[PDB]
Design a protein around this ligand. Structure first.
Ligand SMILES: [Mg+2]
Ligand SMILES: [Mg+2]
Ligand SMILES: [Mg+2]
Ligand SMILES: [Mg+2]
Ligand SMILES: [Mg+2]
Ligand SMILES: [Mg+2]
Ligand SMILES: [Mg+2]
Ligand SMILES: [Mg+2]
Ligand SMILES: [Mg+2]
Ligand SMILES: [Mg+2]
Ligand SMILES: [Mg+2]
Ligand SMILES: [Mg+2]
Ligand SMILES: [Mg+2]
Ligand SMILES: [Mg+2]
Ligand SMILES: [Mg+2]
Ligand SMILES: [Mg+2]
Ligand SMILES: [Mg+2]
Lengths: 159, 185, 171, 51, 222, 58
RNA sequence: GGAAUACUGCCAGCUGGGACUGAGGACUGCGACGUAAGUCAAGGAUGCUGGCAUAAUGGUUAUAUGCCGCCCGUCUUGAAA
RNA sequence: AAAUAUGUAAGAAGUCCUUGUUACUUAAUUGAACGUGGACAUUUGAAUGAAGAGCUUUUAGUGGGCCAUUUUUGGUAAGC
């Protein structure tokens, strides 16, 4: 018959790494999680307690609860045609801080500093990001760079 | 052909021109559609849309609700406006000297208001007193207090009132409702 | 189509590690400039590590024939793909311009080997400046002294459906 | 009630654009450019004519 | 209160002042257009004289025309066409060129013909098929007061102001381009020039980026 | 008589008819599943805060 | 060395022929030409003329001709079967 | 170790400054959470589009499917 257990099809997913087996380093336990932090979920196969289900591997959530060895995480899951919120109790070995939020935070800090320094001058702040613009005109010299002509090559066997 | 991004020929879904064929109500909506077209005050549009409403969307407003609304700071001399029925409440013992404009007053509500010394007013008298709705206070009754809304969204772990005729022991208090009989909900 | 020859010069995009890249040039036979730039990027991707996103085109210029009313003999070296493999061919074409020579080359390849434009590479085309270096008989027979030939069996095209006398094919 | 095309109907062209009258007056559609006698470099010509 | 002469004369005087403003603006636009084109031509000539190569700036503006019907479209290109407002065959829209819009065009390549529009075809498009979106209604432009009332916040007063904002991709290109209703072109008057539309232009078909030949196609379709 | 066993054909079209709307986010999400020791402290802290604010703006 | 011409493109350059349409129904708007009066091709056709005034146009109907058209209802993935 | 698909983020429910409550926590005004007052507004924080956005009740029919390009299993294969 068919087989859909809890860790079905998780062979390579919960495999450890190459040359990174063994005990986990102490920085994962020394990290501090507060309610509202944005975290990434990646299960550690050597820690069988407090594991996330295979659906949440590679998912990003928000902390809502802090306990002795674990963190409560909220994930939005697509079921049918809408999302439901799911509350996960994960040990901190399967959790790391997300870096997207902190990049946006440092952008906000630099943006506010730029706005504040330009507030005393009024110099058209230009605080929005822009996409990659089409490149402007340029002059390409041939001093030491006289153009070299290329031609297609004939067929050869090469074995 | 057009790659339509929205449904074609769909109605707005909002009730204009109320379903009632009460001729006095039609006169009232004629007056207030004139006022809402030509006075640019948001009060007239709000009360026109309220005049369109159905009965369950016009719950009665009690005189206790009116007194509680008049107890707000700076709202003591405002004209209370109820597009609907005003019922009274014997749970209050003192009532202020307000002016209340409404579609209908019960006998107890009208007696309570005129005994406290205020007055009961129809919406067209409200229109000639405050054409732009000056110094008015619109009150709405509780929509989600009906008996029918108890059953809306019935399901597991909802706490949402089974549709049932008889109540008591042995009417839906067994398997599915306690842990001793299978499971609880 | 009716071909034009273009020089296309392009390069890799400049970086801080290396400003002034090496400016590669090609001669492309193409119907228009859009196709010319597409073929430039195709062949440069065959040759060097670059593509359109990481490179740029600094120049494209049409090259006119220098003497478009002188009769030349061209040698053409071609790479092409058959249904079974890849082959090199040398052909030679008597014509008045390089673009006319490559047009009749593409016609001849499609006629004789069913080779389509996507299957042909022009390795090179070059004027054979001296006779007796012409090595194909089908063009060498036009290089004899005081050449003249008739045109037997002239077929004269009528404008009317009915003719009132038997036609003549004299010429 | 009816969309009259500019680029015909010079009346609606002059209604939309007052500059069209003086554009036609100085004939800016056919504007003669100033002649310049500059010549490309020998490196450009030999690169163009290179085999 | 005669009220048929006094405020009528005042309105006429205000109209003459607005027309004078539009006239001097259009003179300035024409002068800067011709200065830009002569400067580009002369820069190319000077680079050739110096022995260098003038690489002109990449195009900032494309015109995109839907070439395929509405049946049998995959969902991601269908969504991108809807977001570019090409919901009908022979519908056209101007697009500002950035990395984001370039990736959109790469998504919808086999259903559009696009390229770089010139001043003449932009002017003919806006003059002949020029419709503004005023409270979700498609209104023929036909007068400068419409453009005054709907785009006058961002300095745009006339149809040539709108044309200038489109061709020189200005700070309110997004607002002006969204104000313009999508252009409803016909089929081309001389045909498509190919036996078969749905190959790339490079392969002898019709879709993709024909760079400067979009002017010929759009003028035959307009 | 055999039949079709399973397919997900037409299912994403059905979901996308009036489908994949995002959940509503609110200020103050619910506190259920949070540590009961924390909640027990939190109720007393909020009661004391309410008394302090009432005495301040009495 | 000095031109010409091709090709490509632009003109708010000029001009001839053909076809289909004429919605709206006092005025109001934006313009153009004029010092002005006013005029105009400027928010949708008017002017001039002829024949007939009747089965002539037209309608209906039978027929002929060109091209097209399988039997309905039903179950069904699928019906002219 | 790709390509294609896939989670999150791109602000006012944000960021910073100062300091009240608690029976929690700490060696400890240490912290945690929730709080009072102030500052930063239209380039308020990428693009494009929005055709309105959000919410609810109730009920029909349906729950035999088949076909094409590409991915793909059994089978020599099949209009399997
Ligand atoms: Mg792994
Ligand atoms: Mg265990
Ligand atoms: Mg119309
Ligand atoms: Mg024709
Ligand atoms: Mg064809
Ligand atoms: Mg079934
Ligand atoms: Mg089974
Ligand atoms: Mg010409
Ligand atoms: Mg008859
Ligand atoms: Mg007849
Ligand atoms: Mg008849
Ligand atoms: Mg018959
Ligand atoms: Mg017949
Ligand atoms: Mg037949
Ligand atoms: Mg059957
Ligand atoms: Mg159902
Ligand atoms: Mg069912």
């Amino acid at each position: 018959g068919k087989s859909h257990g809890y860790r079905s099809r998780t062979r390579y997913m919960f495999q450890r790494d190459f040359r990174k087996h063994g005990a986990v380093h102490l920085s994962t336990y020394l990290k501090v999680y507060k309610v509202g932090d944005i975290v990434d979920i990646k299960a550690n196969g050597s820690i069988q307690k407090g594991m996330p289900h295979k659906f949440y591997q590679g998912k990003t959530g928000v902390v809502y609860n802090v306990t002795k060895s674990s963190v409560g995480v909220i994930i939005n899951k697509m079921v049918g045609n809408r999302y439901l919120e799911k509350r996960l109790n994960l040990r901190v070995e399967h959790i790391k801080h997300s870096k997207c939020r902190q990049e946006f935070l440092e952008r906000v800090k630099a943006n506010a500093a730029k706005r504040a320094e330009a507030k005393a001058q009024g110099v058209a702040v230009q605080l929005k990001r822009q996409p990659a613009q089409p490149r402007e005109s340029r002059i390409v010299s041939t001093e030491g760079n006289v153009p070299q002509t290329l031609a297609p090559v004939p067929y050869e066997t090469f074995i | 052909g057009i790659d339509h991004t929205s449904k074609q020929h769909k109605r707005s879904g909002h009730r204009t021109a109320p379903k009632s064929d009460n001729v006095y109500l039609k006169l009232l909506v004629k007056l207030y559609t004139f006022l809402a077209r030509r006075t640019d005050a948001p009060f007239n549009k709000v009360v026109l849309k309220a005049l369109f409403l159905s009965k369950i969307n016009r719950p009665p407003v009690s005189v206790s609700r009116i007194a509680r609304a008049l107890k707000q700071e700076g709202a003591a001399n405002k004209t209370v406006v109820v597009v609907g029925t005003v019922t009274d409440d014997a749970r209050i013992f003192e009532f202020p000297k307000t002016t209340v404009a409404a579609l209908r007053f019960t006998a107890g509500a009208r007696a309570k208001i005129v005994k406290a010394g205020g007055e009961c007013i129809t919406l067209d008298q409200l229109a000639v007193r405050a054409p732009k709705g000056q110094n008015t206070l619109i009150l709405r009754g509780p929509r989600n207090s009906r008996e029918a809304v108890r059953h809306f969204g019935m399901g597991p772990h909802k706490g949402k009132a089974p549709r049932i005729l008889s109540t008591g022991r042995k009417f839906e208090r067994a398997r599915g409702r306690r842990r001793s009989k299978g499971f609880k909900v | 189509a009716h071909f034009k020859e273009y020089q296309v010069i392009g390069r890799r995009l400049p970086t801080e590690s290396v400003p002034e890249p090496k400016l590669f040039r090609m001669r492309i036979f193409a119907s228009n400039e859009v196709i010319a730039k597409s073929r430039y990027w195709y062949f440069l991707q065959k040759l060097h590590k670059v593509k359109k996103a990481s490179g740029e085109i600094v120049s494209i210029n049409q090259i006119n024939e220098a003497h478009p009313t002188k009769v030349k003999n061209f040698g053409v070296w071609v790479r092409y793909d058959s249904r079974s493999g890849t082959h090199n061919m040398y052909k030679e074409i008597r014509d008045v311009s390089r673009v006319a020579a490559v047009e009749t080359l593409y016609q001849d390849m499609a006629a004789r080997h069913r080779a389509r434009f996507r299957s042909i590479h022009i390795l090179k085309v070059a004027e054979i400046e001296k006779t007796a270096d012409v090595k194909r008989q089908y063009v060498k027979q036009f290089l004899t002294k005081d050449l003249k030939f008739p045109l037997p069996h002239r077929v004269q095209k009528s404008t009317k459906t009915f003719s009132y006398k038997r036609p003549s094919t004299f010429y | 009630v009816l969309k009259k095309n500019p680029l015909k109907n010079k009346q609606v062209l002059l209604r939309l654009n007052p500059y069209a009258k003086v554009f036609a007056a100085e004939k800016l559609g056919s504007k003669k450019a100033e002649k310049t006698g500059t010549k490309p470099a020998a490196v450009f010509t030999e690169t163009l004519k290179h085999d | 209160a005669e009220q048929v002469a006094a405020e009528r004369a005042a309105r006429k005087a205000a109209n003459k002042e607005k027309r004078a403003i539009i006239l001097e603006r259009n003179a300035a636009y024409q002068k800067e257009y011709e200065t830009a084109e002569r400067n580009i031509i002369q820069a190319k000539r000077d680079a050739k004289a110096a022995g260098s190569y003038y690489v002109e700036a990449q195009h900032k503006l494309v015109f995109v025309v839907r070439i395929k019907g509405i049946n049998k479209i995959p969902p991601k290109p269908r969504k991108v066409l809807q977001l570019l407002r090409l919901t009908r065959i022979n519908s056209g829209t101007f697009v500002k060129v950035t990395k984001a819009t370039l990736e959109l065009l790469k998504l919808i390549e086999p259903y559009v013909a696009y390229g770089y529009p010139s001043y003449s075809t932009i002017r003919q498009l806006v003059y002949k098929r020029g419709f503004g979106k005023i409270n979700k209604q498609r209104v023929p432009l036909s007068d400068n007061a419409i453009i005054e009332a709907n785009l006058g916040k961002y300095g745009i007063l006339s149809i040539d102001d709108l044309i200038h904002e489109i061709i020189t991709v200005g700070p309110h290109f997004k607002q002006a381009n969204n104000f313009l209703w999508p252009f409803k072109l016909s089929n081309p008057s001389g045909g498509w020039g190919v036996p078969r539309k749905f190959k790339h232009f490079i392969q002898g078909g019709s879709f993709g980026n024909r760079e400067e030949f979009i002017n010929k196609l759009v003028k035959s379709m307009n | 008589a055999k039949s079709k066993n399973h397919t997900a054909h037409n299912q994403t079209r059905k979901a996308h008819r009036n489908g994949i709307k995002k959940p509503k986010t609110y200020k103050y999400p619910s506190l259920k599943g949070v540590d009961p020791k924390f909640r027990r402290n939190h109720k007393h802290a909020l009661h004391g805060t309410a008394k302090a604010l009432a005495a301040a703006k009495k």
